[PDB]
Design a protein around this motif. Sequence first.
Motif, PDB file in Angstrom:
ATOM      1  N   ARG A   2     -22.210  -6.525 -50.665  1.00 39.31           N
ATOM      2  CA  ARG A   2     -20.957  -6.053 -50.097  1.00 39.31           C
ATOM      3  C   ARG A   2     -20.212  -7.189 -49.409  1.00 39.31           C
ATOM      4  N   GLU A   3     -18.889  -7.147 -49.511  1.00 38.61           N
ATOM      5  CA  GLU A   3     -17.994  -8.111 -48.887  1.00 38.61           C
ATOM      6  C   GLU A   3     -17.296  -7.448 -47.710  1.00 38.61           C
ATOM      7  N   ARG A   4     -17.421  -8.049 -46.535  1.00 39.03           N
ATOM      8  CA  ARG A   4     -16.694  -7.603 -45.361  1.00 39.03           C
ATOM      9  C   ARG A   4     -16.137  -8.817 -44.635  1.00 39.03           C
ATOM     10  N   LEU A   5     -15.218  -8.559 -43.716  1.00 36.73           N
ATOM     11  CA  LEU A   5     -14.649  -9.588 -42.866  1.00 36.73           C
ATOM     12  C   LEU A   5     -15.250  -9.507 -41.474  1.00 36.73           C
ATOM     13  N   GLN A   6     -15.600 -10.662 -40.925  1.00 36.22           N
ATOM     14  CA  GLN A   6     -16.102 -10.767 -39.566  1.00 36.22           C
ATOM     15  C   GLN A   6     -15.139 -11.634 -38.772  1.00 36.22           C
TER      16      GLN A   6
ATOM     17  N   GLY B 128     -16.370 -19.385 -52.021  1.00 34.10           N
ATOM     18  CA  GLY B 128     -16.253 -20.095 -50.768  1.00 34.10           C
ATOM     19  C   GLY B 128     -17.286 -21.183 -50.598  1.00 34.10           C
ATOM     20  N   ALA B 129     -17.508 -21.965 -51.645  1.00 32.93           N
ATOM     21  CA  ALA B 129     -18.371 -23.131 -51.580  1.00 32.93           C
ATOM     22  C   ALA B 129     -17.542 -24.364 -51.881  1.00 32.93           C
ATOM     23  N   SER B 130     -17.670 -25.378 -51.043  1.00 32.99           N
ATOM     24  CA  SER B 130     -17.047 -26.658 -51.315  1.00 32.99           C
ATOM     25  C   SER B 130     -17.940 -27.463 -52.243  1.00 32.99           C
ATOM     26  N   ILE B 131     -17.356 -27.980 -53.317  1.00 36.91           N
ATOM     27  CA  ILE B 131     -18.042 -28.858 -54.256  1.00 36.91           C
ATOM     28  C   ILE B 131     -17.517 -30.272 -54.023  1.00 36.91           C
ATOM     29  N   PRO B 132     -18.342 -31.209 -53.566  1.00 37.70           N
ATOM     30  CA  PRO B 132     -17.895 -32.603 -53.474  1.00 37.70           C
ATOM     31  C   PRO B 132     -17.723 -33.186 -54.868  1.00 37.70           C
ATOM     32  N   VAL B 133     -16.545 -33.727 -55.142  1.00 40.28           N
ATOM     33  CA  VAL B 133     -16.247 -34.259 -56.459  1.00 40.28           C
ATOM     34  C   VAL B 133     -15.652 -35.643 -56.288  1.00 40.28           C
TER      35      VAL B 133
ATOM     36  N   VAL C 228      -7.973 -15.659 -33.898  1.00 39.18           N
ATOM     37  CA  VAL C 228      -8.991 -14.860 -34.555  1.00 39.18           C
ATOM     38  C   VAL C 228      -9.013 -15.290 -36.011  1.00 39.18           C
ATOM     39  N   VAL C 229     -10.177 -15.727 -36.471  1.00 35.86           N
ATOM     40  CA  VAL C 229     -10.409 -16.065 -37.865  1.00 35.86           C
ATOM     41  C   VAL C 229     -11.150 -14.907 -38.510  1.00 35.86           C
ATOM     42  N   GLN C 230     -10.663 -14.450 -39.653  1.00 37.48           N
ATOM     43  CA  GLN C 230     -11.333 -13.418 -40.433  1.00 37.48           C
ATOM     44  C   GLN C 230     -12.183 -14.115 -41.483  1.00 37.48           C
ATOM     45  N   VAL C 231     -13.497 -14.004 -41.348  1.00 43.46           N
ATOM     46  CA  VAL C 231     -14.437 -14.783 -42.139  1.00 43.46           C
ATOM     47  C   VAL C 231     -15.076 -13.861 -43.163  1.00 43.46           C
ATOM     48  N   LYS C 232     -14.951 -14.227 -44.433  1.00 40.92           N
ATOM     49  CA  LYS C 232     -15.602 -13.498 -45.511  1.00 40.92           C
ATOM     50  C   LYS C 232     -17.112 -13.597 -45.373  1.00 40.92           C
TER      51      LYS C 232
ATOM     52  N   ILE D 224     -13.404 -18.895 -47.576  1.00 39.07           N
ATOM     53  CA  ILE D 224     -14.128 -18.150 -46.553  1.00 39.07           C
ATOM     54  C   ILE D 224     -13.211 -17.798 -45.390  1.00 39.07           C
ATOM     55  N   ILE D 225     -12.230 -18.648 -45.098  1.00 43.53           N
ATOM     56  CA  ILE D 225     -11.195 -18.305 -44.128  1.00 43.53           C
ATOM     57  C   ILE D 225     -10.256 -17.310 -44.793  1.00 43.53           C
ATOM     58  N   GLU D 226     -10.450 -16.028 -44.524  1.00 43.74           N
ATOM     59  CA  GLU D 226      -9.608 -15.028 -45.155  1.00 43.74           C
ATOM     60  C   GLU D 226      -8.236 -14.941 -44.511  1.00 43.74           C
TER      61      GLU D 226
END
Lengths: 119, 53, 115, 122, 211
Positions: C38-42, E19-24, C28-32, C81-83
């Motif tokens: 609002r911020e939640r985990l999916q 949570g954004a990847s920046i190509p550098v 199970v991956v908790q995704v931001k 993003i992978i919480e």
Amino acid sequence: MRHRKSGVKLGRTSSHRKAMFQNMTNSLFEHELIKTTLPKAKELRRVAEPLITMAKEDSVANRRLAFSRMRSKTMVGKLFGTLGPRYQNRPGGYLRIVKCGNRDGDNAPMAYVELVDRD
Amino acid sequence: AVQKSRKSRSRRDMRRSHHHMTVAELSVDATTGEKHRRHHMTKDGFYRGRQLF
Amino acid sequence: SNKHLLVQAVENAQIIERPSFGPGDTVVVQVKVREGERERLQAFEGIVIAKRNRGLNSAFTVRKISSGVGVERAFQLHSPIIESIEVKRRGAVRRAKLYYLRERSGKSARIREKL
Amino acid sequence: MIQVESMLEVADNSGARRVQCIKVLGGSHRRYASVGDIIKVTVKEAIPRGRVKKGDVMNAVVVRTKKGVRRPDGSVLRFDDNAAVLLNQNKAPIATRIFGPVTRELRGDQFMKIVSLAPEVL
Amino acid sequence: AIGLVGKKCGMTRVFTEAGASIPVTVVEISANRITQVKNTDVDGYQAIQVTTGTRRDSRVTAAQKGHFAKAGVAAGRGVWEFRANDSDLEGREIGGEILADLFEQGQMVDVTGNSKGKGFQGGVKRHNFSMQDATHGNSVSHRAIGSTGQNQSPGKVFKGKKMPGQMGNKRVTVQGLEVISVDVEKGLLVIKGAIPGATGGDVIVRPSVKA
RNA sequence: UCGAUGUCGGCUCAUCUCAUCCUAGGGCUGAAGCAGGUCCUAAGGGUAUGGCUGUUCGCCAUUUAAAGAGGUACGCGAGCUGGGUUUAGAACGUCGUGAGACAGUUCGGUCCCUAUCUACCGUGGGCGUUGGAAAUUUGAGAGGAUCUGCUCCUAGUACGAGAGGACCAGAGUGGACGAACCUCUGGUGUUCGGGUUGUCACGCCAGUGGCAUUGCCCGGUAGCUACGUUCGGAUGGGAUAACCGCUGAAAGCAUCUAAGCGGGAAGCCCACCUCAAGAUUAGAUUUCCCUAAAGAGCCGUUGAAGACUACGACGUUGAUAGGCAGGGUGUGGAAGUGCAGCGAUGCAUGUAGCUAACCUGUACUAAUUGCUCGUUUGGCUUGACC
RNA sequence: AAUUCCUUGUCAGGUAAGUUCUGACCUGCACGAAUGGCAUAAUGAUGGCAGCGCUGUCUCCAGCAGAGACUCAGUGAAAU
RNA sequence: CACAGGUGAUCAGGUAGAGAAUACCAAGGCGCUUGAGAGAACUCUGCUGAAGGAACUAGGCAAAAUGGUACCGUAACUUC
């Protein structure tokens, strides 16, 4: 392009080139000095020296790996009986290439491949 | 696909103004004193003070 | 490791800790998720079918069947993003990539458990 | 990546089951539609006595693709089918039930009911 | 408008908190030692000449060695010039140092580099020519150039006609890249984007001309 | 032109014109707004995909800012195609007693040329540039590039009876196009790792190898690569086009013009990117050297450089290549041994064994201070200084 | 219509869109009964049209293998 | 022409296989009278290919695909 690519073609198929370098490795392990074409001599290091490195330590698995890549039981015995011990403490460089001119029949640049430490 | 006139000998030879035989670099072996191609062993097996036969 | 030492210095400061898992296990991956303000985990649960281990460029693709249709997501391991990752059940597989599972549906899509 | 002459599954209850892309809209040489892109379709096979009939030309939005959709962190999210949702003459959904998941690329204003009706939004 | 010379070390990514990847790509920046200041009176134009890297003495000629010793700098692997102006030449004197702090985080730069060399390439790859029919009776002209002109009038091929030839291994500038991070102590520049060339190649980083 | 200048259409690749299709600037309007119409200026860019038919065209479907009109041997077959037309076969309708015939139809029916010269795309060699050399350069000039939608906001404001609905400013986000790049997503990955069929071999078992498209199959490193990523097309300067003026006479008025002063376009010239002193007007700056010097080259080890070249690096005062060492990556659990099982097989030893091209090191091997070329202060005249 | 010029006749079907195809009409330029008429199972490397599967045919080409091309050594043409 | 063509009959090993097909081998016989490098464009012959799947084209040309045995099952129509 061929950016960073290794290996040779030598106008052969892959299986022919593998067979030819297996033959050349056996001939060099036997005679300790062989005359060959210079590109072949340079590519021969990349296949013959790793066998010496592996024969540095004697085991059933390593002798079987040598036999799978060499297919010569006399040369595997020789590689694990004299060449492994002789080059035990040498960090690579078991062959030396000595340029020796050009072939008569087609003007190919030629070289001598010598096992270091007597050949 | 083919020439409309024969080329003149002058232009034929200007095209050959780049033909040239290659001349090998030579050295003297320190031990034997013999002439050899540079970075090549002598005809009798000597290179950089080392025998081969 | 495969990179220039300066690339390594930039890359090593961004490594995030995470549990070990192999291809074949259920995670199970908790995704931001930004729902707007609002911020939640999916939770994305499914079978790890492929990994690529590339330091900070490490990735793993998780497959599930969600409401009939198969969904794969190729998560980037060290992305924020992978919480969180939790390994729910470990699988016994004979290979590193279970791409053959894309042509399996039910009874034939089930992974033996590692005990 | 959906192009003209691509079959899409229908992910709503409008009576069509398979549509064919006949136009990718929004540009004079535009090649591909991803999720959230509006296409012109013909419906190729519909359910009997449904709202939409076979051979109809109408608007759709792509809601899932097999090529996948990229996320800002660099992840890709792929689906097992290519699926669209039929639209009105004003490019608004004509659906009361959405089948299968959709992605958060439909967030906005004109596909908000698709998002709220989907069983799950990736 | 003075910049600096670096070495491409390769590409990676920088993750943002959102949570954004920046190509550098990472530029190794050894100090740019000023070997010559040019001016309107002596040269007719204003510029800073710098050397970066290192070169061994056997590879430094006597002329270049005298040129470096005049500045009092150690010989680098190359010498580069930067077109300056009166404001740019303010505190930059001969023998001085240019470090990565010439650039600040978030600022736009242009990066010039030597493209990766593709060698001899056909029209399809070099100029995005369309291929001709793979099947349908096409004889031997799948990647052929096609027509190269017209009939009796004009009776020639026009100059600048797209043809095969060398491709890549040329000077390329990518404009409007963002500086992601700067580390003078590490000699490190992290720039958003792609940056021409292969890793190891010399790159020039200058403040952006668009801005 | 008949001692031969290959037809139509398509494909590929174009190039120019402007009588302009879109975008730009304007006057008039039966211009309220939004949309238009007509004309003037304008050629910088851009200017669809399908169904039918050999079609060009045309009709149609669906788009688009738009789906321009033309010239170029109705551009382009020593670049491709060969469906139509236009050989020899055959048939129908028709005409002819007949042989046969038909801008009637129908089914079928060999498309050659290794490029000398000019041209063009690339890439070298020579010599020259007022002594030679190593670099760094200025820019006379040349090329590239130049497109545009939609949303939001101003503002549901101005305008309008309503319906509708702005200019001018601002913000964002796309399409098409182009470049670079490979971090990511993928493709490929025939010297990487496994599984497996048949057969032959390695004395045999076990373990392995050859061959069968890499036998087949599943993955996959580096490199290359797009469909992936990032970036670009400037809102600036100058002079203008149409057009609009200010002041102003000729011509007491009027009048953009005759003197004088303004505004004004995707167009012109700059600005951006690339090339650029064979720019024979051959430029500049800094250093180095001259009884074979300073250097350059040959040679060698070579490189994300490359057809050959050239270009880049290095040659023991050395990491240039290979090997080797340690890593990483990929594969996925080696062999041997043991245990369970009648056995196929399973399990442990142990994520093991192997691992191309990757990363960091390291003189173990190979890069021999060898040879060649290149000198000896660089003419004369005049002027300023000395 | 292997026959119909006008002609892409008309009407129906199929497609988003069909000068071809299928069905029908009859206004047969210029069918028609052993130079046979109309059909017809089976058969055909026969003509046309339509689908499923499948795909580098194409969007739009990428990577890779081998043989040439390229460089060296030997031999050494051709049309014009 | 020491030419990838043509040329009647006879003999007919092994393991798989229906087989004189095919694959790999035996006995026996060969490596086909220029090589060596390099690993550009382009040509030829192959292999793999995201997403789409005939949009290609005169036309699915070419390719891709199918493919064995046993059993089950098999429509219109028919001269049965």
